[PDB]
Amino acid sequence: ADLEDNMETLNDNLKVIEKADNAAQVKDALTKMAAAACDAWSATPPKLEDKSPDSPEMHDFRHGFWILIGQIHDALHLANCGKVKEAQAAAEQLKCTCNACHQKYR
Amino acid sequence: ADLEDNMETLNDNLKVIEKADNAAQVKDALTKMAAAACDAWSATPPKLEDKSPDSPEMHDFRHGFWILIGQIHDALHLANCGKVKEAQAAAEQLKCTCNACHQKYR
Amino acid sequence: ADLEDNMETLNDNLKVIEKADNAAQVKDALTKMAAAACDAWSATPPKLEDKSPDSPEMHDFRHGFWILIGQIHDALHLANCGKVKEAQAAAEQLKCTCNACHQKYR
Amino acid sequence: ADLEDNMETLNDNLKVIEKADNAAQVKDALTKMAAAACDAWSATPPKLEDKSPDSPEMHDFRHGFWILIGQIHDALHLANCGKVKEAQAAAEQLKCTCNACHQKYR
Ligand code: HEC
Ligand code: HEC
Ligand code: HEC
Ligand code: HEC
Ligand SMILES: [Zn+2]
Ligand SMILES: [Zn+2]
Numbered sequence: 001a002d003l004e005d006n007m008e009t010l011n012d013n014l015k016v017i018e019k020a021d022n023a024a025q026v027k028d029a030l031t032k033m034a035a036a037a038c039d040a041w042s043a044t045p046p047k048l049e050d051k052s053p054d055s056p057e058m059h060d061f062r063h064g065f066w067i068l069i070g071q072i073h074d075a076l077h078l079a080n081c082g083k084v085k086e087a088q089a090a091a092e093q094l095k096c097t098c099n100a101c102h103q104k105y106r
Numbered sequence: 107a108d109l110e111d112n113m114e115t116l117n118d119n120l121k122v123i124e125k126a127d128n129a130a131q132v133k134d135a136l137t138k139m140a141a142a143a144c145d146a147w148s149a150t151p152p153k154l155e156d157k158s159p160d161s162p163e164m165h166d167f168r169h170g171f172w173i174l175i176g177q178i179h180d181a182l183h184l185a186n187c188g189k190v191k192e193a194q195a196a197a198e199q200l201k202c203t204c205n206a207c208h209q210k211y212r
Numbered sequence: 213a214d215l216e217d218n219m220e221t222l223n224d225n226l227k228v229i230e231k232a233d234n235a236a237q238v239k240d241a242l243t244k245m246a247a248a249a250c251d252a253w254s255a256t257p258p259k260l261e262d263k264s265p266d267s268p269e270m271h272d273f274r275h276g277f278w279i280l281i282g283q284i285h286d287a288l289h290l291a292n293c294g295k296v297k298e299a300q301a302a303a304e305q306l307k308c309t310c311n312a313c314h315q316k317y318r
Numbered sequence: 319a320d321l322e323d324n325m326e327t328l329n330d331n332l333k334v335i336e337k338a339d340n341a342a343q344v345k346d347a348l349t350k351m352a353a354a355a356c357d358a359w360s361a362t363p364p365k366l367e368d369k370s371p372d373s374p375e376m377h378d379f380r381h382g383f384w385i386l387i388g389q390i391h392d393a394l395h396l397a398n399c400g401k402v403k404e405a406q407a408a409a410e411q412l413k414c415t416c417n418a419c420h421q422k423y424r
């Protein structure tokens with residue numbers, strides 16, 4: 001349930017994808033990431049603890065997760081259809097979403 | 107967190123939108139729908155009760171939720187912006203995603 | 213390349229998908245709909261001839277086309293994977309984007 | 319019309335968004351990038367002239383453009399709402415799509 005725990009689960013499963021052998025491994029990891037992302041959006045990060053839940057900073061923080069869930073969905077199509085290289089390449093593009101949110105609120 | 111309960115909160119909040127006057131009411135209903143959707147995809151429907159979580163059928167079952175969440179995300183842009191009518195029209199288009207899943211797994 | 217011709221293209225190719233025998237016929241028809249959608253969005257519909265290109269109605273008019281292109285994209289995943297029936301059902305959900313615009317602007 | 323011209327349009331307008339002062343400049347530049355993306359996806363790049371138009375590389379080539387159009391769509395929400403800064407940040411998240419495609423196919 002914890003924001004820090006959700007970030008650890010996102011971190012571990014991202015590496016899993018990068019170095020996966022089969023599609024079953026990639027799909028398992030992406031589904032775990034989707035769970036963590038769904039649980040993370042409702043949390044308030046330390047940096048934004050003083051700002052209202054309707055601030056333009058709390059929008060955007062939530063928005064980051066909608067984008068990530070969209071990317072996971074897209075990777076899932078590729079993994080399920082046995083394109084393991086394409087799935088791994090797509091997963092590499094998640095980092096961009098990771099980095100942009102971290103550069104503002106981490 | 108029950109599948110039936112999450113469906114109720116989805117069904118209720120969609121009617122709230124239809125009858126809303128201001129944008130703040132729309133934002134509040136869409137956030138609740140997003141939480142329910144994020145909570146419902148992990149559950150197993152009575153029609154697939156004998157199927158494994160990593161089975162092919164469970165994969166397409168979760169697919170409808172990925173599409174739903176992206177439509178809530180899109181509607182949220184309009185509601186946060188203050189475009190009440192357009193947000194209501196966006197919310198209406200959800201009904202098709204609701205319908206398609208129900209045809210297959212209900 | 214005018215609005216009416218592009219609407220004929222979308223209409224015809226949607227029938228092609230519904231009556232398709234194979235995935236290759238589905239791929240071909242989705243490609244043609246993507247080209248039609250890409251060519252249609254810059255046009256001005258007769259009912260908004262009095263409005264500026266930069267106006268809330270014209271932003272909304274073009275929006276319907278980003279949604280359609282996104283749905284075509286999703287359906288192409290399914291047809292490239294060889295999932296013909298799933299791709300035919302996904303193409304059916306396009307109809308709601310068709311009707312949403314038509315109710316406002318046709 | 320040809321792929322090189324399309325790529326210059328994308329490049330020029332991306333710089334314009336970075337250096338933009340008003341929402342009107344961002345709107346116009348994002349719209350021009352949407353048209354360029356739409357005219358680019360049907361071409362065949364030099365490095366894939368020897369491959370089949372139904373090959374996984376050609377599928378992946380076209381796919382990069384659907385992702386870009388979705389990101390331009392996303393940024394236009396922010397720009398049409400007058401929100402210049404976050405429309406500009408959204409526009410930066412788009413380089414990751416530019417780079418993934420050049421890293422494999424340019
Ligand atoms: C890709 C999807 C992501 C990976 C991999 C990681 N994140 Fe994040 N993240 C975000 C915040 C606000 C924090 C700080 C939370 C706090 O300080 O309490 C983090 C933190 C991490 C961490 C460090 C965890 C630790 O205790 O050391 C890791 C390893 C991590 N994140 C990996 C915010 C966001 C965010 C905003 C919307 C996104 C999209 C991501 N994080 C994505 C990723
Ligand atoms: C699959 C991807 C689904 C999507 C998307 C939506 N729903 Fe659903 N819903 C789904 C199932 C499998 C069921 C049946 C579960 C059961 O055993 O009863 C339902 C059920 C409902 C119900 C009936 C609830 C009840 O207790 O009888 C309603 C009112 C309902 N769903 C509404 C609904 C709405 C409004 C949605 C979109 C906004 C929607 N659902 C999406 C599966 C899926
Ligand atoms: C707005 C975003 C639209 C979307 C999405 C779709 N259509 Fe459309 N269509 C639209 C307009 C404004 C019009 C009127 C054009 C005019 O100059 O009068 C239309 C018209 C049609 C027609 C009739 C064309 C004619 O014979 O005059 C058809 C058959 C049609 N549209 C089909 C169609 C389909 C199948 C779509 C979904 C894939 C669709 N349209 C989307 C605006 C919009
Ligand atoms: C693949 C799906 C691509 C995406 C997404 C983007 N680009 Fe691209 N670009 C791509 C190819 C295959 C090529 C080479 C074409 C050739 O004839 O060699 C390019 C090339 C460019 C160039 C070079 C222009 C020139 O004179 O040769 C530029 C400046 C360029 N691309 C910019 C660019 C930008 C800014 C993008 C993101 C918005 C982008 N490209 C995406 C393939 C793909
Ligand atoms: Zn995709
Ligand atoms: Zn939108």
Ligand SMILES: [Zn+2]
Pocket residue numbers: 073077169172286289
């Ligand atoms: Zn999908």
Ligand SMILES: [Zn+2]
Pocket residue numbers: 063066179183392395
């Ligand atoms: Zn968005």
